[PDB]
Amino acid sequence: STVPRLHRPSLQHFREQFLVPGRPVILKGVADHWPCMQKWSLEYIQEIAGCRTVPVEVGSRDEEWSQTLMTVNEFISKYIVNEPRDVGYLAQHQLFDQIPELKQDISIPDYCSLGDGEEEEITINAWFGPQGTISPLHQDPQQNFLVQVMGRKYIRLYSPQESGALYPHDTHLLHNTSQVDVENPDLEKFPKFAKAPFLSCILSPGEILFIPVKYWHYVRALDLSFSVSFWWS
């Protein structure tokens, strides 16, 4: 079944029915009027950040992801517009600490204040990449508000209760990552994955997905996509 969509729910309503229990939800009417929703085009991102060095993750379309450095202009040029030869992702980067002028175009969701951490310790990451970027099925150690700004993203969510049916890697460095290709699972090797229930959604611009702490999430970009994630506790 699908992730429920709620429009500007109260802090208490979000705290009691989702944050505390750990239930995913899509929040509407919250970030749809953030400045990023009208300003951030490729033309705008180049003007404000084109000459800045950003980390980019590259990988083949069972291959393997390496990490390099290049200017935003370079990234867009040879991973977004010019019929890219490989997949490049400006992923998990604190672009807004590097570029404060872009931090004016977003805010911190008020729902974060319901956490036991400090606002200064919230990690804001930019996920800027082309159609086709795919995360592995994985779980993070903090709460997360995934704000979609450009394009859409298909996202699958498995509860932490389903960890057994997701076959996590046994190396400590990857114990938070699933061995299973979500959208083409090897059921002969990972049979328990087939009967694991899940939530799914297509996250579209203006929307915020609340990924509870340690909720397994799988993300695939359907179009040219720019997402901003808020990791908070």
For the annotated binding site for a protein, the residues are 57, 92, 135
Residue 187 beta carbon to ligand HRR: minimum distance, rounded to whole angstroms: 23
Determine, following the binding rule CB under 6 A, whether residue 36 of this chain makes contact with ligand HRR. no
Report the site for Mn ion in 163-202 (rule: CB under 5 A). Answer: none
Determine, following the binding rule CB under 6 A, whether residue 150 of this chain makes contact with ligand HRR. no
Span interacting with ligand HRR, options 16-24, 39-47, 114-122, 127-135, rule CB under 6 A: 127-135
Residue 78 beta carbon to Mn ion: minimum distance, rounded to whole angstroms: 26
**Dihedral over alpha carbons 160, 198, 109, 96 (to 10 degrees):** 80
Report the site for ligand HRR in 85-114 (rule: CB under 6 A). Answer: 89, 91-92
Determine, following the binding rule CB under 6 A, whether residue 123 of this chain makes contact with ligand HRR. no
Residue 159 beta carbon to ligand HRR: minimum distance, rounded to whole angstroms: 15
* 14 token code pair: 């979000």
On the 0-12 / 13-18 / 19+ scale of CB atoms within 10 A, 119 is exposed
DSSP assignments along 34-95, one per residue: STHHHH--HHHHHHHHTTSEEEEEEE------EEEEEEHHHHHIIIIIS--SSEEEEEEE-H
Which is closer to ligand HRR, CB of 63 or CB of 186? 63
> Please, which residues have CB within 8 angstroms of residue 200's CB and are 6 or more apart in sequence?
1, 2, 3, 154, 155, 156, 157
Which is closer to ligand HRR, CB of 84 or CB of 188? 84
> Please, which residues have CB within 8 angstroms of residue 223's CB and are 6 or more apart in sequence?
131, 150, 151, 152
List residues binding Mn ion (CB under 5 A). 140
What residues make contact with ligand HRR under the rule CB under 6 A? 57, 65, 89, 91-92, 127, 133-135, 140, 144, 146, 211, 217, 219, 227, 229
